[PDB]
Design an enzyme around this catalytic site. Sequence first.
Site, mmCIF file in Angstrom:
data_model
loop_
_atom_site.group_PDB
_atom_site.id
_atom_site.type_symbol
_atom_site.label_atom_id
_atom_site.label_comp_id
_atom_site.label_asym_id
_atom_site.label_seq_id
_atom_site.Cartn_x
_atom_site.Cartn_y
_atom_site.Cartn_z
ATOM 1 N N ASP A 132 37.631 35.702 35.583
ATOM 2 C CA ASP A 132 38.774 35.001 35.954
ATOM 3 C C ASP A 132 38.682 33.804 36.650
ATOM 4 O O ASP A 132 38.261 33.800 37.880
ATOM 5 C CB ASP A 132 39.600 36.209 36.842
ATOM 6 C CG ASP A 132 40.894 35.756 37.284
ATOM 7 O OD1 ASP A 132 41.341 34.739 36.815
ATOM 8 O OD2 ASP A 132 41.605 36.506 37.891
ATOM 9 N N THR A 133 38.851 32.760 35.896
ATOM 10 C CA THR A 133 38.989 31.222 36.565
ATOM 11 C C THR A 133 39.909 31.104 37.817
ATOM 12 O O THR A 133 39.730 30.212 38.620
ATOM 13 C CB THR A 133 39.018 30.139 35.628
ATOM 14 O OG1 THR A 133 40.221 30.328 35.245
ATOM 15 C CG2 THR A 133 37.956 30.257 34.581
ATOM 16 N N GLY A 134 41.147 31.918 37.690
ATOM 17 C CA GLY A 134 41.981 31.785 38.666
ATOM 18 C C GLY A 134 41.602 32.529 39.873
ATOM 19 O O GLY A 134 42.626 32.486 41.176
HETATM 20 O O1 LIG Z 1 45.354 36.553 42.433
HETATM 21 C C1 LIG Z 1 44.676 35.553 41.949
HETATM 22 N N1 LIG Z 1 43.943 34.773 42.687
HETATM 23 C C2 LIG Z 1 43.241 35.324 44.006
HETATM 24 C C3 LIG Z 1 42.223 35.905 44.139
HETATM 25 C C4 LIG Z 1 41.655 37.175 43.232
HETATM 26 C C5 LIG Z 1 40.535 37.866 43.484
HETATM 27 C C6 LIG Z 1 39.798 37.599 44.781
HETATM 28 C C7 LIG Z 1 40.146 36.376 45.724
HETATM 29 C C8 LIG Z 1 41.400 35.777 45.309
HETATM 30 C C9 LIG Z 1 42.055 34.583 45.806
HETATM 31 C C10 LIG Z 1 42.901 34.062 45.080
HETATM 32 O O2 LIG Z 1 42.242 33.090 44.114
HETATM 33 C C11 LIG Z 1 44.989 34.918 40.643
HETATM 34 C C12 LIG Z 1 44.556 36.209 39.681
HETATM 35 C C13 LIG Z 1 44.867 36.234 38.523
HETATM 36 O O3 LIG Z 1 44.025 35.567 37.772
HETATM 37 C C14 LIG Z 1 45.200 37.526 37.683
HETATM 38 O O4 LIG Z 1 44.108 38.370 38.288
HETATM 39 C C15 LIG Z 1 43.693 39.409 37.580
HETATM 40 C C16 LIG Z 1 44.461 40.671 37.049
HETATM 41 C C17 LIG Z 1 44.696 40.917 35.684
HETATM 42 C C18 LIG Z 1 45.499 41.970 35.145
HETATM 43 C C19 LIG Z 1 46.311 42.544 36.306
HETATM 44 C C20 LIG Z 1 46.231 42.496 37.419
HETATM 45 C C21 LIG Z 1 45.213 41.217 37.824
HETATM 46 C C22 LIG Z 1 46.583 37.966 37.595
HETATM 47 O O5 LIG Z 1 47.269 38.250 38.724
HETATM 48 N N2 LIG Z 1 47.198 38.235 36.455
HETATM 49 C C23 LIG Z 1 48.260 38.818 36.227
HETATM 50 C C24 LIG Z 1 49.371 37.800 35.759
HETATM 51 C C25 LIG Z 1 49.646 36.281 36.095
HETATM 52 C C26 LIG Z 1 50.589 35.396 35.707
HETATM 53 C C27 LIG Z 1 51.402 35.974 34.694
HETATM 54 C C28 LIG Z 1 51.274 37.175 34.084
HETATM 55 C C29 LIG Z 1 50.224 38.195 34.657
HETATM 56 C C30 LIG Z 1 49.939 39.591 34.220
HETATM 57 C C31 LIG Z 1 48.513 39.620 34.832
HETATM 58 O O6 LIG Z 1 47.523 39.142 33.964
HETATM 59 O O7 LIG Z 1 46.189 34.528 40.392
HETATM 60 C C32 LIG Z 1 46.605 33.139 40.663
HETATM 61 C C33 LIG Z 1 46.689 32.791 42.085
HETATM 62 C C34 LIG Z 1 45.816 31.925 42.474
HETATM 63 C C35 LIG Z 1 45.851 31.471 44.071
HETATM 64 C C36 LIG Z 1 46.830 32.007 44.623
HETATM 65 C C37 LIG Z 1 47.631 33.134 44.185
HETATM 66 C C38 LIG Z 1 47.499 33.495 42.677
#
Ligand SMILES: O=C(N[C@H]1c2ccccc2C[C@H]1O)[C@@H](C[C@@H](O)[C@@H](OCc1ccccc1)C(=O)N[C@H]1c2ccccc2C[C@H]1O)OCc1ccccc1
Lengths: 99, 99
Positions: B25-27
């Site tokens: 996960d690059t996000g």
């Molecule tokens: O939350 C995020 N990052 C935070 C994080 C994560 C782990 C540790 C630390 C930190 C800090 C911060 O960087 C990322 C995570 C995103 O890549 C993904 O997680 C895996 C995931 C995959 C499937 C189900 C649940 C979760 C997700 O929600 N997919 C969902 C999604 C997103 C957009 C649209 C649809 C869908 C459905 C899912 O795939 O979201 C972007 C973001 C960046 C910064 C601040 C807020 C938000």
Amino acid sequence: PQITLWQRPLVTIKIGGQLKEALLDTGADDTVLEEMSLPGRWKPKMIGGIGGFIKVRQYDQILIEICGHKAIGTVLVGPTPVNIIGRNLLTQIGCTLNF
Amino acid sequence: PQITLWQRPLVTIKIGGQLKEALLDTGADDTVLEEMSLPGRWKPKMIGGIGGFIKVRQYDQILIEICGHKAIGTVLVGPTPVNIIGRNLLTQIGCTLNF
Ligand SMILES: O=C(N[C@H]1c2ccccc2C[C@H]1O)[C@@H](C[C@@H](O)[C@@H](OCc1ccccc1)C(=O)N[C@H]1c2ccccc2C[C@H]1O)OCc1ccccc1
């Protein structure tokens, strides 16, 4: 280009004639942008990530320009903390993960 | 290897002698895994995602093998919906985004 991950992979996108900053997110299935107005009808949808679910508006066949690359796909709009470019659009610009 | 994004970028990781599936996960700034037992003391941390914040346990200098590459770093453990390999470890394995 080749983007390293030392910092968040943020890029400039163009949508609806507006320039915005978004995150290239391989962990996101779809693309979600902060509240904004888009043309056409929309359907409600619930998306879940870390922290739970949020309600968004789903718009289809939206044109977006990512780093100069044109892409078409579904774009979700809602209370997301940051603009997210998900896999549905990353695939269209030929984005891959390499190591 | 080069991973496309037509499907979720899931890979097998090895931690604590166990195989698990995780998302590249690059996000994600950090790496967070589903509830499990890890050695040593932990520190508190709050991470925010699209749906809000969750409290996790932070363990440092943890050995984790990702798709064959050995990495040693910080791993968070908490109520995450899926195992997430974040930028902190993606950089250790030399992962980049390309298009
Ligand atoms: O939350 C995020 N990052 C935070 C994080 C994560 C782990 C540790 C630390 C930190 C800090 C911060 O960087 C990322 C995570 C995103 O890549 C993904 O997680 C895996 C995931 C995959 C499937 C189900 C649940 C979760 C997700 O929600 N997919 C969902 C999604 C997103 C957009 C649209 C649809 C869908 C459905 C899912 O795939 O979201 C972007 C973001 C960046 C910064 C601040 C807020 C938000």
